Each structure stands twice: as C-alpha cells, then as structure tokens.
Write a new protein. Sequence first.
Length: 188
Amino acid sequence: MFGNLQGKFIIATPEMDDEYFDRTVIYICEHNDNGTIGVIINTPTDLSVLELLTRMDFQMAKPRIYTQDQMVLNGGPVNQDRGFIVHSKTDHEFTHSYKVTDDITLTTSGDVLDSFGTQTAPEKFIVCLGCSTWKPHQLEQEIAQNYWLLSEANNQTLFETSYLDRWVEANEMLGISGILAPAGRALE
C-alpha cells in the first residue's frame, strides 16, 4: 500500500556501477496505479549541464572564466525528451513548476531558463534527463523484503539536510545503516 511514495527516498548505495562518488539517488517523484515514478536508477552521462545549454541556444550564460561544469545525469529511460530540474524555494517566482513538496519544486519546461540569470535564481538545483518508472506496486513488495531501505524526506532533509555540504547524507539520515542489500547469497 504505502501512503504515497512521493517525498520518500530509498537507500540503495550501489557498489559502484559507472558512478564513482558524484551523487547517487535522491528521491521518488510520485506513486500511482500506473506505476512508481522516481529518480533512483543512477546513470551519469559524459555531458555537462552548461555544455548542453551553451551548445544549443543558451550560449550567454554565467560560467565565467572558471570553465568548470556540472555533469548531467539520466534519470531513467522514460521521459528522456525533457530535462527535469529539481530546485529549492527562492524568492516568489513560479511559472512552470510541479509540486513535489512545499519547498521542492520540479521545473522542466522553459521556466528553468527564466530562473537562472537573474536574482530570482534558485540557490541549489539538480538536473536529470528523464525519470524511471517502477512496476506498479512492485517496489512496495521489494521494500517489504527489506531489499530497499525506505526513509522519508522531510522537505529540507531532501535538498538541504542541515544545509552546508554533505556526502552519503542519505545513508546518514538514518544513522549510518548497512546490511540488507549486499548479501552475496545467490546460489544457496
């Protein structure tokens, strides 16, 4: 059942699998009869967020002489047509944003280009191309197997969590939890 998997996150913690250290898993978008929409697959690309912007028709951005960029990740095989930007509350702008929670706003169409470039630009934002859709009700059973570590994301906990800097924060949110994922007991 589960009272809406939206605003929740699951602690997978991959062994490695292409990714090395630069952010792994964030949250579940929603939970519907048609399936469970979330970005927890983890699959980074060799393309950068500013790379695609400047390459297309957003040439005049503000990367300055730093030249450094942020890599864009694929959120899943579904909705690959659109890049989803998750950001926090900033000022009182809002044109094309979908409510994940009160502070967390999902912007993908147009509005994001309006956001950054002015003083109403969100402090922090993450971009993912597409999203993943899990089988209807399946994830619920998988979590019941204790194969997935389920924890809620209390608004600020999702995007800020104390707000300063964090790595492995998702695993720390519970209190450094291990076991129940890597068992290595296949043939037995």
